[PDB]
Amino acid sequence: GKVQIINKKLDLSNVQSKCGSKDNIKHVTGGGSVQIVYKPVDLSKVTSKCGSLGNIHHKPGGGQVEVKSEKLDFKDRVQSKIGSLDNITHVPGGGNKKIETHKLTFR
Amino acid sequence: GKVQIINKKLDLSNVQSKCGSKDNIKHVTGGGSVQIVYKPVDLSKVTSKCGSLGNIHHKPGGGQVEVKSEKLDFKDRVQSKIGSLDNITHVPGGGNKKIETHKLTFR
Amino acid sequence: GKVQIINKKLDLSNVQSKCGSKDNIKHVTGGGSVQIVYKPVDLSKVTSKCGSLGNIHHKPGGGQVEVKSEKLDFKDRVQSKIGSLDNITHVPGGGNKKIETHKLTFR
Amino acid sequence: GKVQIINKKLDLSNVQSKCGSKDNIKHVTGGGSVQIVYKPVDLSKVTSKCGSLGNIHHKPGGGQVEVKSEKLDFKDRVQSKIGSLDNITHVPGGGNKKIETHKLTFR
DSSP: OEEEEEEOOEEOOEEEEEEEEEEEEEEEEESSEEEEEEOOEEOOEEEEEEOTTOEEEEOOSSOSEEEEEEEEEEOSOEEEEESOEEEEEEOSOOOEEEEEEEEEEEO | OEEEEEEOOEEOOEEEEEEEEEEEEEEEEESSEEEEEEOOEEOOEEEEEEOTTOEEEEOOSSOSEEEEEEEEEEOSOEEEEESOEEEEEEOSOOOEEEEEEEEEEEO | OEEEEEEOOEEOOEEEEEEEEEEEEEEEEESSEEEEEEOOEEOOEEEEEEOTTOEEEEOOSSOSEEEEEEEEEEOSOEEEEESOEEEEEEOSOOOEEEEEEEEEEEO | OEEEEEEOOEEOOEEEEEEEEEEEEEEEEESSEEEEEEOOEEOOEEEEEEOTTOEEEEOOSSOSEEEEEEEEEEOSOEEEEESOEEEEEEOSOOOEEEEEEEEEEEO
């Protein structure tokens, strides 16, 4: 006779909580210019096979992102006023619980 | 006789909570110009096969993104006023729970 | 005799909650110009096969996105006023629960 | 005799909640000009096969998107007023639950 609980599990399991606030580029003040380039991706492919006495000129006018600001003139005040700023993050949650029970009762 | 609970699971399982606030480029103040380029993607392909005494000129006028601001003139005040700013994130939730029970009762 | 519970599962399972607020480019103030280019995608293909004494000029007038602002003149005030700003995120939910029971009762 | 519960499932299953607020380009104030280019896609194809002493000029007048603002003049005030702004997100829901039971009762 055999009365068994057998656990031969292969457990590559993931349990994850991400709770609260995640801010990128918050509260950026510029008197003249604010320039932001966020996560540009370039996956361009260029192939150039040149034969005998051949000529290839790969000369695009610019790259992926070009941002330009010029000739800004301010005569009077440039000002920012904030009376109060509160950045509150309260995380009572984000709890992980993993339970595994094996109970064998024999009579 | 055999009375068995057998667990031979292959557990590559994912449990995940993402709870609360995620802000990118929040509260950006510029007196003259705000320029934002967000996640441009370039997957362009160029192929240039040039034969004998051939000529290829690949010369596009610009790249993917060109942003330009010029000749801005302000005589009087340039101002921003905020009386109060509250950024509140409350996360009581986002809880993960994983339970696994094996119960064998024999008479 | 065999009385069995057998679990030979292949569990590549995904359980995920995404709860709350996600803001991109919120509250952007510009006195002169605001220029935003959001997620441009370029999947253009160019093929240029040039024969003997041939000539190819691939010269498009510009790339994908061109944004331009020029010659803006302000004599009097340029102003923004906000009395109060509240950004509140409350996430009591977003809970994940995964339960797996094996119960064998023998008489 | 065989009394069995057999679970040989191949579980590549997806359970996901996305609950709350998702804002892109919210609350953008520009004194002169606001220029927004949102998710332009270019899948253009150009093929140029040039023979002996041939000539190809691929010269389109511009690329996909061209946005231009020029010569704006403001004599008096340019102003924005908001008395109060509330951005409230409340997510009590967005809960995922996955239950799997195996019950074998033998007499």
